[PDB]
CSV table of C-alpha atoms in Angstrom, one decimal:
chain,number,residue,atom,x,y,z
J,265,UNK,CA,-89.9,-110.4,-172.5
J,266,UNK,CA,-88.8,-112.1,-169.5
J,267,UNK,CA,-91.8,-114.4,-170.0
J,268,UNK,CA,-91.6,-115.3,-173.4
J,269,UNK,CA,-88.0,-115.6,-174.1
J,270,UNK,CA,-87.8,-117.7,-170.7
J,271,UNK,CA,-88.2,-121.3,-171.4
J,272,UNK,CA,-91.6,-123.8,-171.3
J,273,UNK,CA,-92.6,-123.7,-167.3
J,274,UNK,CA,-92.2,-126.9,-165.8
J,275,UNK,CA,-88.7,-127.7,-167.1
J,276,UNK,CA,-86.6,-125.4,-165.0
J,277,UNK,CA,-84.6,-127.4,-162.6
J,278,UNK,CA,-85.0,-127.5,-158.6
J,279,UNK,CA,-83.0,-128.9,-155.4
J,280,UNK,CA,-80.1,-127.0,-154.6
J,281,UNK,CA,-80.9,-124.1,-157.5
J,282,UNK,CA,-83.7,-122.7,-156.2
J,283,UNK,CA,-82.0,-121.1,-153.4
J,284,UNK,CA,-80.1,-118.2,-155.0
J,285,UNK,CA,-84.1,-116.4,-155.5
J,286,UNK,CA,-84.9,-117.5,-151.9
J,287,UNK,CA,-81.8,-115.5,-150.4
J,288,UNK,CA,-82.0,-112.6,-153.7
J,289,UNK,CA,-85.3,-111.8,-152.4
J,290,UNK,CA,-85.0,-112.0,-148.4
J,291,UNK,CA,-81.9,-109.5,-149.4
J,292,UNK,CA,-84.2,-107.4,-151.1
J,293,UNK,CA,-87.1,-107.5,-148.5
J,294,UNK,CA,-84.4,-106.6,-145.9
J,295,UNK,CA,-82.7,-103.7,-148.0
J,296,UNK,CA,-85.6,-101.9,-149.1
J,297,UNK,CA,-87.4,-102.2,-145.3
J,298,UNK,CA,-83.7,-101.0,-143.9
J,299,UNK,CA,-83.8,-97.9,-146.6
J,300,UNK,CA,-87.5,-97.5,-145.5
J,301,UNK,CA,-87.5,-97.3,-142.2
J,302,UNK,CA,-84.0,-95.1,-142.0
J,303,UNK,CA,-85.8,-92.5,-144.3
J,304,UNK,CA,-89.5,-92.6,-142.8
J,305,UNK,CA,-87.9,-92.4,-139.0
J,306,UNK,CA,-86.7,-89.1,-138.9
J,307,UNK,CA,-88.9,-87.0,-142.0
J,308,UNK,CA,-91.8,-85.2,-140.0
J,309,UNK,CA,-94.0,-85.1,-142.7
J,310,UNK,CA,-95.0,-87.5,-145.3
J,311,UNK,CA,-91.5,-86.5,-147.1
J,312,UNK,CA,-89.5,-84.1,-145.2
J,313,UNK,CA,-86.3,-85.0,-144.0
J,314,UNK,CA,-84.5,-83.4,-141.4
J,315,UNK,CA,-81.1,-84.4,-141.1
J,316,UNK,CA,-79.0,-86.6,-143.8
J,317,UNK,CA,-79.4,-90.5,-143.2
J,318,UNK,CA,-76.4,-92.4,-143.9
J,319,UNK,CA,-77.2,-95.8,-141.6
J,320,UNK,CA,-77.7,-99.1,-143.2
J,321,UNK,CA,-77.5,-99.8,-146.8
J,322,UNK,CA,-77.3,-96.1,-147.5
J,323,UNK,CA,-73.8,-96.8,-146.2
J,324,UNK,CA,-73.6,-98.9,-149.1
J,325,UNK,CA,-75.1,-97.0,-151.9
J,326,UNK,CA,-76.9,-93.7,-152.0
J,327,UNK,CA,-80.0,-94.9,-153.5
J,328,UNK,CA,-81.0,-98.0,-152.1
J,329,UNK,CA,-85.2,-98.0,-152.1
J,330,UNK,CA,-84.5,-97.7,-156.0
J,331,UNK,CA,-82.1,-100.6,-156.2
J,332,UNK,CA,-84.1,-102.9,-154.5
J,333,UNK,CA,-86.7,-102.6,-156.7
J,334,UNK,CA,-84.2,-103.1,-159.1
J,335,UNK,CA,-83.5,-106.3,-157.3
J,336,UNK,CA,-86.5,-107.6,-157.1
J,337,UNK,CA,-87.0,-107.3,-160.8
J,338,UNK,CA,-83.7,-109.1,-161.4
J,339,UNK,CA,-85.4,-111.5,-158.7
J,340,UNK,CA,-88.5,-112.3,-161.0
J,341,UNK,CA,-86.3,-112.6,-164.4
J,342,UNK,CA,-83.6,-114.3,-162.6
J,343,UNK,CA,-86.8,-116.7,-161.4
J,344,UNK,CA,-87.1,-117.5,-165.2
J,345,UNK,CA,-83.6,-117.5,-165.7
J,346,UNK,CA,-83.8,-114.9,-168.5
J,347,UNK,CA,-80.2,-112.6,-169.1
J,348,UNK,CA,-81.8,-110.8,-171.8
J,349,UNK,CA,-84.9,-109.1,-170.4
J,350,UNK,CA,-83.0,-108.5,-167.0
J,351,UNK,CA,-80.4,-106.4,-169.3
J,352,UNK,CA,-83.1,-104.1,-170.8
J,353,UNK,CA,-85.1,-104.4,-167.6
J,354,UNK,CA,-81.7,-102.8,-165.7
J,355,UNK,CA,-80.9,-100.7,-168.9
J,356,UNK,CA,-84.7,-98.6,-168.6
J,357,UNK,CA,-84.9,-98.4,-165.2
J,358,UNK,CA,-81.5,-97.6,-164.8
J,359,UNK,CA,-82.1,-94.8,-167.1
J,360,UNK,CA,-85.5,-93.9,-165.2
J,361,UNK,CA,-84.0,-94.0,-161.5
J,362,UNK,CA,-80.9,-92.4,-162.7
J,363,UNK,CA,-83.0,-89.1,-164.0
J,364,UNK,CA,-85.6,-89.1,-160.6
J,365,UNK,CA,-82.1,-89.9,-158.8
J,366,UNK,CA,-81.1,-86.4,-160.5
J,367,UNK,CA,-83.1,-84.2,-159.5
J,368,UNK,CA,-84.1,-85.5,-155.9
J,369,UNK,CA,-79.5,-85.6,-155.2
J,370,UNK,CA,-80.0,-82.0,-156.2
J,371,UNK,CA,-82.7,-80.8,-154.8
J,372,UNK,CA,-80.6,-81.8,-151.5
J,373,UNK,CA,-77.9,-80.7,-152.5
J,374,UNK,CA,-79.3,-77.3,-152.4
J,375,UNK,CA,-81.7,-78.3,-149.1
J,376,UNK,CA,-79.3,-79.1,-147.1
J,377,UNK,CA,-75.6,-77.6,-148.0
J,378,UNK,CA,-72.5,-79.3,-147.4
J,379,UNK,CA,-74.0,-82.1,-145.5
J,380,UNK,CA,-75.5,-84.2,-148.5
J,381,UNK,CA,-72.4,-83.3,-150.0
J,382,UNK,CA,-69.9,-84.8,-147.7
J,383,UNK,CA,-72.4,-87.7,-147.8
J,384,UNK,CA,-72.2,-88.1,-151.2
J,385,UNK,CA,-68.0,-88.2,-151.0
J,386,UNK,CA,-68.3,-90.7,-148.9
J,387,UNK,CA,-70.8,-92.8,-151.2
J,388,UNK,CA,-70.5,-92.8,-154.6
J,389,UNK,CA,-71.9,-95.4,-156.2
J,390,UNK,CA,-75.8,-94.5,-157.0
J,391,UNK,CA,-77.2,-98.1,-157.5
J,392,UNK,CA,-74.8,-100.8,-157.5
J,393,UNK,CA,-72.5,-101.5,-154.9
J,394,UNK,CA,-68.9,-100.6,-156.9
J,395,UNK,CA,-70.7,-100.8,-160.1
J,396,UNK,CA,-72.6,-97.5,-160.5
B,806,UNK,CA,-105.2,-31.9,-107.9
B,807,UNK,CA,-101.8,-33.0,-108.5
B,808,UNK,CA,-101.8,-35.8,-110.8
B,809,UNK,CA,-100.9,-35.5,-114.4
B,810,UNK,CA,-101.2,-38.1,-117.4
B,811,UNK,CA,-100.4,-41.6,-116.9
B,812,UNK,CA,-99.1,-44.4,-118.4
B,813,UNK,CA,-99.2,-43.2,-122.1
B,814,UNK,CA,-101.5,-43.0,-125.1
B,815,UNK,CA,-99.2,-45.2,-127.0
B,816,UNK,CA,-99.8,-48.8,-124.9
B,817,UNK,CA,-103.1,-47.5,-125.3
B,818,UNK,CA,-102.8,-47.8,-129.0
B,819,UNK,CA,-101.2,-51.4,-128.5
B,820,UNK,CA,-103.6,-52.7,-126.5
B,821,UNK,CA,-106.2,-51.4,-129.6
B,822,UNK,CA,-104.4,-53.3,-131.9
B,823,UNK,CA,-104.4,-56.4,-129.4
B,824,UNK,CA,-107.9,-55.7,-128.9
B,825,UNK,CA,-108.7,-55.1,-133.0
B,826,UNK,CA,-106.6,-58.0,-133.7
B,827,UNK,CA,-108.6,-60.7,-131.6
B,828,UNK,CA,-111.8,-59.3,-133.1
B,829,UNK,CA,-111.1,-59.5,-136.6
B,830,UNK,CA,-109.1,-63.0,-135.8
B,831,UNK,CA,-112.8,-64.2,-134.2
B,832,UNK,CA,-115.1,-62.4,-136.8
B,833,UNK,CA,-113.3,-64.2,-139.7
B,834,UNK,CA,-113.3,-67.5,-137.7
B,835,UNK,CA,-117.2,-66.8,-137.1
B,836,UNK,CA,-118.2,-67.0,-141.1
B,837,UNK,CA,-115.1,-69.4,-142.6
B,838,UNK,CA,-115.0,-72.2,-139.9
B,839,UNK,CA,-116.7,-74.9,-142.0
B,840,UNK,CA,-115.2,-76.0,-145.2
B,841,UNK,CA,-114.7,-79.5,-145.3
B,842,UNK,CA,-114.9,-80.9,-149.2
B,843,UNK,CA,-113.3,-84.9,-148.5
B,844,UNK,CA,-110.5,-86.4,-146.8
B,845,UNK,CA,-109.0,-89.2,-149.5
B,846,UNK,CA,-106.1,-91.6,-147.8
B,847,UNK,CA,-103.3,-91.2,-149.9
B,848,UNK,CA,-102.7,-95.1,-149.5
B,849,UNK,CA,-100.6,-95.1,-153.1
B,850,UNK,CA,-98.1,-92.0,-152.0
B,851,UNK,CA,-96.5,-92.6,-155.7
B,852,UNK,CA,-93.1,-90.3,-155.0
B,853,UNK,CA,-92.1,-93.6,-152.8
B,854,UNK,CA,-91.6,-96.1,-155.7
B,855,UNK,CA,-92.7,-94.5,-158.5
């Protein structure tokens, strides 16, 4: 939808423009490889974590991997400059992420006890920074 | 003679299930040792995006 209700390809404008996606994206890159990296350096296994991380951008949001795949689809629509598309795009996959985001925040909720909990106090928002 | 029983007949009975123990461990690893189907990467681990 982004594709077709976007506009004919070579007419979108350039110079100074085209540098909101560039920044959007190394954002995203860096985001999702912080959230990464802070929950693949202490899990043992494949997905076991041992204690509760709360460095980086999960100091900013409690589900951050999700988000930045959020962000990168608002990247490509934003690309195309396309409102619509990125509204239902957000709308499904918020509705998506916000059911996995269920379960897995209580399945550690139980895991761990009080330690996801007070993490959780101190981070509300789920995947937008003040927004959700 | 002087000497009566020693030590017991109840570390005797440990050291019979120590003993029983390691043989049944090594007779079952004699027969099941091998059973090796495939080994598949898991290279799209989907609980990480998906």
């Amino acid at each position: 939808l982004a594709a077709f209700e976007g506009p004919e390809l070579h007419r979108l404008p350039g110079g100074w423009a085209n540098v909101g996606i560039w920044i959007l994206i190394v954002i995203t890159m860096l985001m999702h490889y912080d959230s990464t990296l802070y929950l693949a350096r202490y899990s043992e296994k494949v997905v076991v974590p041992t204690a509760v991380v709360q460095f980086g951008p999960y100091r900013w949001v409690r589900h951050p991997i999700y988000a930045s795949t959020m962000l990168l689809f608002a990247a490509y629509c934003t690309a195309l400059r396309a409102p619509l598309s990125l509204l239902f795009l957000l709308a499904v996959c918020l509705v998506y992420y916000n059911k996995k985001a269920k379960m897995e925040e209580e399945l550690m909720v139980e895991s761990f006890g009080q330690s996801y909990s007070d993490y959780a106090d101190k981070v509300r928002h789920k995947f937008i920074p003040f927004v959700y | 003679p002087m000497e009566t029983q020693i030590i017991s007949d109840d570390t005797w009975k440990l050291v019979d299930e120590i003993w029983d123990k390691k043989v049944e461990e090594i007779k079952a690893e004699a027969v099941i040792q091998i059973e090796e189907e495939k080994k598949k990467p898991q290279i799209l681990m989907a609980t990480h995006f998906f």
